[PDB]
Nucleic acid binder design. Structure first.
Lengths: 69, 188, 170, 134, 106
RNA sequence: GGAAUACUGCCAGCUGGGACUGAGGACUGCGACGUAAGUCAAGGAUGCUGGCAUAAUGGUUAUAUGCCGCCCGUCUUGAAA
RNA sequence: AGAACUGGCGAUGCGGGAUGAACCGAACGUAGAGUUAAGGUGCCGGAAUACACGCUCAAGAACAAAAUAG
RNA sequence: GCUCCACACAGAUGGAUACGAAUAAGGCGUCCUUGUGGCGUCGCUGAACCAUAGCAGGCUAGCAACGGUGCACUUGGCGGAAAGGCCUUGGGUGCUUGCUGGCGAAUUGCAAUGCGUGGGGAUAAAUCAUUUGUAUACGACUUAGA
């Protein structure tokens, strides 16, 4: 399953952006900007929000070599 | 996969069942064996009563079918060693199905059943008859209280069947709906 | 698996004996080398010619004409046993000659404990008309609208534990 | 009156529908065309594209479906009889084919599809548990 | 969520060994739901960890873990050989081991 | 009549997954890319990231675990003894 | 009894053979990866309760031997 | 064991999900021909059923039902093979993801799985002393006196 990330501007993020040299305000602003753009596409299909809110976990009888991810 | 496995000895070969149980519990799997008296050995009564007195005429000898199965299992495990002794501590053998194992599911081993292993039209021996012939004195009580075990367990199964009837009716009435069709489309 | 190989030889033609008899026989083997070895052995046994005094003219695999048609084959088997030698005739029902000869070899190794070394396939002949077959166990599969069941199937279970108590029905 | 239980065994015969379990043609249907011996039987499955070849009865499981077919029928005749008898339509109606299809679909289920299945199962149960007890 | 497991459970059978000679450097691990070499091929290279409870305190927990890696398949019943930085104590025969999914190839 | 397929062999064909190995120590040579500048998988691991001084790790010994190991030297003898 | 012609061992580890000097493979610096021999793959023991054809109810895995297909 | 003082610590992490019997027959539904009955349906494995969404699973505003269920109560029966477990009438208090939304996740920075003593207060009982002899090489065994 793939969402249309074309609408999200990812040019700002780079390797030096994550350098670790209370969270920086600029980081929070960028996260909010990314979330605002991504939520519109995520809600465009049913259960995508709920699906992403659910934590993946294995169950008895599950065969990862058989499960089609 | 199962924390504890209950195996119904009825209809199984002593050798194959012992070998599979030894291999399984050597890997740390806990196994419980029930209805050992109903375990079967290939061949008619003669040649099964024999080969037992032959080693008997040599120590201590146990007549109970469970003890016979344990002896068969004991020789397939490297006893006298810590791993062998520890492995044998994960095994339990009883005649019939004493509680609380009577209230839990019992499994079978397809590769050890007499039906699937013995060719049709060949005589076979049963552990209960041999044990009684070699001095076992609890076959009568074992059979008597095993018959009682089937009693009221048939009634429990009937009640479960009645409940599943209502469950199936509830599923059917809700079936064919939009949600039901959506689930069926995805193989569920 | 086996294959049919046609092998010919003319004992290294020399002066005063041009164009020799050109012995021919249809050898059965799993490879060309075994076919050539068996051809040499048969020539030595049945003819006054040795491997060092011969030449393999050609060797080509022969495939059955109709590997789908069910046919009956009569085989004139000759083999060496614990005492002397005894000619034998048998009838085998198989789709192809290779399968028929393989089954014949298996039966010989089973009902006679004879191996490829002592077994000689003199001739295999197809039979199609009814009443020409003689063995009862081959006539058994020539009745009109023949139908038989397969009771007590032994279908295998991968898992060591089964909760179904499987039934042998078919 | 006289009583005899079903005891109906799936008999091997010309035109018997058989599903192959082992080999390159596993999972495909075929029809028996002739009998060779107690162990090997000739089959043809031109509908599924399987080649006409001899197969041991242990490599194949007999299906309850049957149709008329002359003994030794070639590929063309076998295909004609298969089309006429509507063998494919009968196979799909059988619960065995439906179970095979369900197993294949479950194997092909995606993780997001699995989550959707879980949600729909919860929704269906919410009503199933309310249908009972009253 | 009910289950938090993200690894395939497995059982440690025994080290690679001859009749009278054993090689503790190579361990044999059984993977649940695996019975053929082809199925075990997917588990090659995955990190395998062994979890056991300790009596004395440690650097911030009470659990001690021994990490390992899958090297190659073993036998025909889906058995797979595993190697660890520190070999198992040989007392874990039949114990439970955790076969993680990473590194992933899907 | 024609497709194929079945089988043997070739590819100085393509494309992944798994395990061990990092040996040498400024350039001398055989080769490829490119009109050239220059580059390269071309006579041996390069770069990044993650944990650390009440460290990280390693070491000594008691038991335990899976397997193995007839008590030492001498002489008899062709051998074990 | 008497010899004798070439060979296995003399001083020889290692793997298999329940153990063995007359067997099979193979002869030796310290380790890793990989591929094998004899020998095996129901457990002890690492590995297919593999596949296919028939045989045998009793063991079966040189001496008491002579009396289901063609 | 009742009480005070003084000290102390072989491998759960989804559910072992329960008729019996045969294997040259079996279950499931229906009905009458109540029987070894007729019909349809299912196997050819457990690749199945439960539940499985929420910070290692929070706060919180609404909608749809009068359900599902965790915990402590209460009613009745049941389980003697190693019962010690099974339900279950009634109400109490929480969740409910059955449905519609909001609040927070960050910096751990790219993974390092993430439970009784040793000293006292009372005392139920044992052995020795005595005796007993139906016991006796020495242990042991057999009696009784607040």
């Amino acid at each position: 399953t793939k969402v249309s990330v074309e609408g999200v501007n990812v040019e700002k993020f780079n390797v030096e952006y994550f350098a670790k040299e209370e969270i920086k305000a600029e980081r929070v602003e960028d996260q909010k900007v990314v979330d605002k753009a991504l939520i519109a596409e995520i809600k465009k299909t049913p259960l995508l929000k709920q699906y992403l809110s659910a934590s993946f976990s294995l169950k008895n009888g599950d065969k990862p070599h058989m499960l089609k991810f | 996969v199962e924390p504890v496995v209950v195996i119904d000895g009825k209809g199984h070969l002593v050798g194959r069942l012992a070998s599979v149980v030894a291999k399984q519990l050597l890997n740390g799997q806990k196994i419980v064996v029930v209805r050992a008296e109903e375990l079967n050995i290939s061949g008619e009564f003669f040649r099964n009563k024999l080969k037992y007195h032959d080693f008997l005429r040599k120590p201590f000898h146990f007549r109970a079918p469970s003890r016979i199965f344990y002896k068969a299992l004991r020789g397939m495990v490297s006893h006298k060693t810590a791993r062998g002794k520890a492995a044998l501590e994960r095994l339990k053998v009883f005649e019939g199905i004493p509680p609380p194992y009577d209230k839990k599911k019992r499994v079978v081993v397809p590769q050890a059943l007499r039906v699937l292993r013995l060719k049709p039209g060949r005589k076979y021996t049963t552990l209960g008859k041999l044990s009684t012939s070699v001095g076992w004195k609890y076959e009568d009580v074992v059979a008597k209280l095993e018959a009682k075990r089937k009693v009221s367990s048939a009634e429990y199964y009937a009640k479960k069947r009645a409940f599943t009837k209502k469950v199936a009716s509830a599923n059917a009435t809700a079936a064919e709906s939009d949600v039901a069709k959506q689930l069926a489309a995805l193989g569920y | 698996h086996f294959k049919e190989y046609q092998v010919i030889g003319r004992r290294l033609p020399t002066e005063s004996v041009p164009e020799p008899k050109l012995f021919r026989m249809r050898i059965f083997a799993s490879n060309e080398v075994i076919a050539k070895s068996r051809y040499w052995y048969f020539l030595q046994k049945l003819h006054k010619v040795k491997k060092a005094s011969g030449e393999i003219v050609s060797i080509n695999q022969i495939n059955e004409a109709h590997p789908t048609k069910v046919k009956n084959f009569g085989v004139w088997v000759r083999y060496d046993s614990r005492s002397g030698t005894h000619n034998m005739y048998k009838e085998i029902r198989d789709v192809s000659r290779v399968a028929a000869v393989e089954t014949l070899y298996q039966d010989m190794a089973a009902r006679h404990r004879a191996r490829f070394r002592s077994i000689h396939i003199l001739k295999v002949a197809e039979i199609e008309k009814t009443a020409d077959v003689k063995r009862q166990y081959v006539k058994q599969f020539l009745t009109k609208d023949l139908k038989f069941p397969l009771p007590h199937r032994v279908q295998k279970s991968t898992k060591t534990f089964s909760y179904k108590r499987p039934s042998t029905f078919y | 009156d006289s009583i005899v239980k079903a005891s109906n065994w799936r008999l091997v015969e010309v035109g018997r529908v058989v599903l192959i379990k082992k080999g390159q043609s596993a999972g495909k249907l075929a029809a028996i065309v002739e009998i060779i011996d107690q162990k090997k039987v000739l089959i043809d499955g031109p509908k599924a594209g399987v080649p006409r070849q001899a197969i041991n009865l242990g490599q194949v499981v007999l299906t309850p479906l049957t149709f008329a077919l002359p003994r030794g029928a070639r590929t063309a005749t076998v295909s004609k009889k298969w089309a006429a008898a509507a063998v494919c339509e009968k196979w799909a109606a059988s619960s065995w084919a439906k179970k095979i299809a369900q197993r294949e679909r479950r194997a092909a289920l995606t993780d997001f599809e699995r989550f959707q299945v879980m949600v729909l199962r919860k929704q269906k149960r919410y009503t199933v548990k309310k249908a009972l007890a009253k | 969520a009910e289950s938090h497991r993200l690894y395939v459970k497995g059982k440690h059978l025994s080290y690679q060994r001859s009749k009278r000679v054993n090689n503790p450097n190579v361990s044999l691990i059984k993977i649940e739901g695996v019975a053929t070499p082809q199925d075990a091929q997917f588990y090659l290279g995955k990190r395998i960890a062994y979890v056991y409870r300790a009596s004395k305190e440690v650097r911030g927990s009470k659990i001690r873990v021994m990490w390992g890696k899958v090297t190659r398949t073993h036998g025909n019943s889906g058995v797979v050989r595993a190697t660890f930085r520190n070999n198992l104590p040989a007392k874990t025969f039949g114990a439970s081991v955790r076969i993680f999914l990473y590194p992933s190839n899907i």
